[PDB]
Each structure stands twice: as structure tokens, then as C-alpha cells.
Write a protein that binds this ligand. Structure first.
Ligand code: MG
Ligand code: MG
Ligand code: MG
Ligand code: MG
Ligand code: MG
Ligand code: MG
Lengths: 304, 306
């Protein structure tokens, strides 16, 4: 709490979509039309989140307000679920298991089993808008990443109830599923109108480059949100874990996390440069996919 | 060169060896001469000292058939010849020859005959494939073929790095090394051979996935830690000691010490996840229990066998 989070210099630049602030208000609008917030709740603490500006970081400049609005809706729904169902506990394990079962039922195009639960309406709306804006994409892969995201959330809840942070290694492993970064990649492909060949996405080099990018993004998020997650007792934070198991001050832990981020950025750049020599050019959809991976890296730094 | 001191690795995982081990050793040589990977009157003492049959004994049950132990020895011997000729040497092979090797070996995995039955590696993989299909009934052949394709791609990556003469980033190497050793294929083959197959609803669970990654990391880093000298002489820069010394500014001794400490930390993490698994809804009872036990088998096998 009484520590100073270092900066992260990453050589990735990107322009923001101009309608960002709009989506902010729209976020609140949607957030009030679904049930995550109700009517006479101050929107200034919610506009300060900047849900629309992050969505602007995730879509092209030449994108529709429909697309930017959908990205804002999805990022707003993720924020409410992660805050309500994971970090507070609180909710019982039976309630969260039912939430997971029912949300996984929505992804199978079936109606929300409890349309009075606000999260059910929210995910149903996100799913219908996503199916309206997408043409050809691997829905099965996204549903699988969502199942693993739910399992990682259950893991996060186990650790939070234990009151202890996981091992740094075990946390790095489970954090890739805990943030749904692969689902983010799949949705960025489906939304922005590009889909790489599965003959490339399954390539080992592309696989490990995706893992490196997800590591950088999620560790940057942890480094920035350490204070907020530490106050709430959310021990699923790499700073928590490094301080706990490696015997470091919270300041030393944050510094080591920043250095690990720098090293992982170097690793990502090395792999990316090696990709063309392996027979994978960053030309067509693969190029846009790598550029979207890079988007989320810079987005975390500049947005946080 | 100078002198390096490989630290020891204490892991609280114990396992008995299959008794027919030494037998398999000789059998390995026999098979290596019956396929073309070994020629006529070549001294078997440098090959028996490898202990390909003893590792196979570490990978199968005590109460297992000589058919099973023999297939395990054949497979571990074929991996050793392929990995040494097609990866670490480049004498050497051209990139086109290795690309043809990969295409043809992946063609064997599609149940087609070896395109070049005079190439010893082709006969070897053909024999391994027919023996594997003879000893297995219902298993994920597709998953193993996918792991073999990624293994071949990681081999191409290893060759790119060796040709560059430079080791990759530690992180980039840890990421690729899991494919460079075919450890997931090893898990799949251990399931298929020893007569157990976990539910895909469990193997796809995130906890099981990351526990598999932890086990593979431990195994591969231990392998790197022990084979650093052999891979350093051969210019094989796909070694975690190489990479840590190169990019983190450490002595080779400091790099080996750092790799050993990372191995210790990853063992701790593996134990933490394994203990957490039942709370997540995954008991270590049926085939999942035997799967976790096989993961532990390879972690101990690396330490004790090397
Ligand atoms: Mg969370
Ligand atoms: Mg949170
Ligand atoms: Mg966070
Ligand atoms: Mg090799
Ligand atoms: Mg080798
Ligand atoms: Mg080695």
C-alpha cells in the first residue's frame, strides 16, 4: 500500500480511437440498462475507469461505433464479473459454480437460466452483440478459453479463501487463464475482421509468442493493480506472490516484477523477429494478429 | 575450456526401476543395428553406458511386459538418434534435408509407408509407429501427432538458433523447450502404453494443463542442467544454462546454479498445484492419479538417470 509502482517502457505505439469518452458514458448507460449499476449511482467513479478508452485501444481507428461499443460492453462486463465474483469473497462456492454453469449455458446459445441475475443479462447481451458483429470465427475455441477462465477463477477463489498467494510459478501458469487473454486474442480476431490460419495459430512459435505477450500484459496489469488487489485481499497478484515466497519487500517485489516484464518484452521481440525465419511471415492475418498482441501490451501500460 | 560444477537436485519423488533394464540396454543396440542407426561392428560400451533401457525401465511399471519395456526402449533410442543427428550437429544436415525429414516422418504418422525406406530414421520411426499401434487400443493419436508436429517446429527453431550461434532469451527458451523435448508427447505415450487414459474433461482443465507445464519445465530444465557440457561442446545453444549466462550476465557456474534454483522453485510450485488439485474438483484417484504419478516419474527419472 505504501509503495511506489515503477514505470514500464515498451517500444509499442498506437493511436487511440476518438469516440473513447463516448463509450465511457455508453458503458454507464449499458451498465444501467442491464443491472450492474442501477439508475441513481454516480457515474464519475465509473467514467474514471475508462472502459471506453481501453476499448478504443483494442479496435482500429476506422472502426464502427457498433464495434467500439461492443468492445466497451465486453470490457465492462469483464470488470463487473471479476470484481463481484472473485475478489470480494462475498459469494458462496455454490453460487459461483451455478454462475459458471449458467454462463457456460449462455455460450451454447441457450437462454439465461436466471434472467433476473444481472450478470446473466449482461453476458447474454454480449453474446448476442458478438454473434451479430462476427462472421467466420472459432466459437468453440473461445468457449474452451472461457471454461478455462472459469476454472482459473475458481482457483483464484481457493487462494483468496486460503488468504495466501500462490507460488510465483503456479501463479504465472494460472494467470494466463485468469485474465482470459487468449479469449481476448480470439475476440480481437473475430471482431476486427481477421482470422489467421489454424496452421499458423497452432505453430509452436506462435503459441509461445502468444504466451509471452499474455505474460507481459497480465504481469503489467498485476504490477499496476497491486495496491487495489492488495487492499481487497486479492492475493492472486505477482507482487503478492514474489513478496511471499521469495522473501522480498513489496517494493523489491514490484521492482523484480518490472524487471521480469522487461526481460519478457525482450523475449517477445526476439521470438517475433525469429518468426519469419521459421516460415511464418507477419504479412496477412498473422501480421494483424501479432499487431493485436502488441496492442494489448501497450494498452496495459498506457491505460493503467 | 574451463571447469563447471553441476549441482545436485533433491526431489522427494521415489520410484523403483524395472528389473529387465540392462537387458533392454543390449536390446536397444540390437534394434539400433536392426534398423540402420548403428552399423555392424560398433562398440556397444559407449551405447550401453547411455542406459537407454534403464530410462525405459524408469518410464514403465515394474509389473510390465517385456513388450512394453522393449517398446519404451525402442522409442527412447529413436528419439536419441533423431535428436542428435537432425538438431545438434549442424558435419550437419541442410535445412532442406531436415524439412524433408519432417515432412516424411509426419507422413509416417499418417500411417503411410516411409517415403525413403533407406534412411535409417525412416525405418526407425516406422517400426516405432507399428509397435505403438500394436500395443495401444484407444488413445489420442491425433493429440500425439499434433505434439510431434510442434516438436518438429521447435526442432527447426533450435536449428535456427544453433546456426545463429547464439542462445535464445531465457523466457523464449523455456517456452520452446517444452516442445523441443516432446514432453507432452511423452505424457500421451505414457498414458497410451501403460493402459490408462484420463478423461479429456480433466486433461483440458486449466489446473492440469499448468501442472503438466510445470512438470515439463522441471524435467527439461534438469535435462539442460545435466547436458550443458555435452550441448556446449556441440555448439547446441538451446540450453537454459547457455541462455542464462548469455542474457543475464552470469558465469556458467552462476547460470547452472540459477537453473538449479529455478528447478527447486518449480518443484515447490508443482507440489503446491498438485495439492490444490482436489480442491478444484480434480481428485488424484483414477487415470488422473496415474497421470500425475507419471508426471512425477519423469521428474525423478531425469535426476536419477542423468
Ligand atoms: Mg481477477
Ligand atoms: Mg480483480
Ligand atoms: Mg489486476
Ligand atoms: Mg535436441
Ligand atoms: Mg540433443
Ligand atoms: Mg539436453
Amino acid at each position: 500500500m505504501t509503495i511506489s509502482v515503477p514505470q514500464l517502457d515498451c517500444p509499442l505505439s498506437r493511436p487511440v480511437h476518438p469516440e473513447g469518452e463516448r463509450a465511457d458514458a455508453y458503458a454507464v448507460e449499458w451498465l444501467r440498462g442491464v443491472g450492474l449499476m442501477a439508475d441513481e449511482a454516480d457515474a464519475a467513479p465509473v467514467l474514471a475507469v475508462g472502459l471506453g478508452r481501453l476499448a478504443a485501444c483494442y479496435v482500429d481507428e476506422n472502426a464502427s461505433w457498433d464495434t467500439l461499443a461492443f468492445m466497451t460492453i465486453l470490457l465492462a462486463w469483464y470488470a463487473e464479473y471479476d470484481d463481484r465474483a472473485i475478489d470480494s469473497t462475498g459469494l458462496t462456492d455454490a453460487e459461483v459454480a451455478e454462475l459458471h454453469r449458467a454462463l457456460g449455458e449462455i455460450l451454447r446459445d441457450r437462454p439465461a437460466p436466471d434472467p433476473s441475475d444481472p450478470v446473466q443479462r449482461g453476458l447474454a447481451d454480449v453474446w448476442r452483440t458478438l454473434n451479430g458483429l462476427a462472421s467466420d470465427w472459432d466459437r468453440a475455441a473461445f468457449v474452451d478459453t472461457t471454461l478455462r477462465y472459469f476454472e482459473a477463477n475458481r482457483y483464484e477463489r481457493v487462494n483468496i479463501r486460503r488468504g495466501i498467494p500462490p507460488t510465483p510459478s503456479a501463479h504465472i501458469g494460472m494467470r494466463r487463464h485468469g485474465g482470459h487473454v487468449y479469449g481476448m486474442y480470439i475476440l480481437g480476431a473475430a471482431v476486427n475482421g481477421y482470422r489467421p490460419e489454424r496452421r499458423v495459430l497452432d505453430h509452436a512459435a506462435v503459441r509461445e509468442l502468444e504466451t509471452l505477450a499474455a505474460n507481459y500484459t497480465s504481469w503489467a496489469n498485476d504490477l499496476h493493480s497491486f495496491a487495489r488487489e492488495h487492499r481487497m485481499g486479492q492475493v492472486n497478484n505477482l507482487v503478492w506472490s514474489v513478496h511471499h515466497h521469495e522473501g522480498l519487500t513489496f517494493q523489491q517485489a514490484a521492482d523484480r516484477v518490472a524487471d521480469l516484464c522487461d526481460k519478457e518484452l525482450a523475449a517477445y521481440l526476439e521470438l517475433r523477429q525469429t518468426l519469419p525465419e521459421l516460415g511464418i511471415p507477419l504479412t496477412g492475418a498473422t501480421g494483424r494478429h501479432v499487431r493485436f498482441l502488441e496492442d494489448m501490451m501497450w494498452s496495459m501500460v498506457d491505460w493503467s
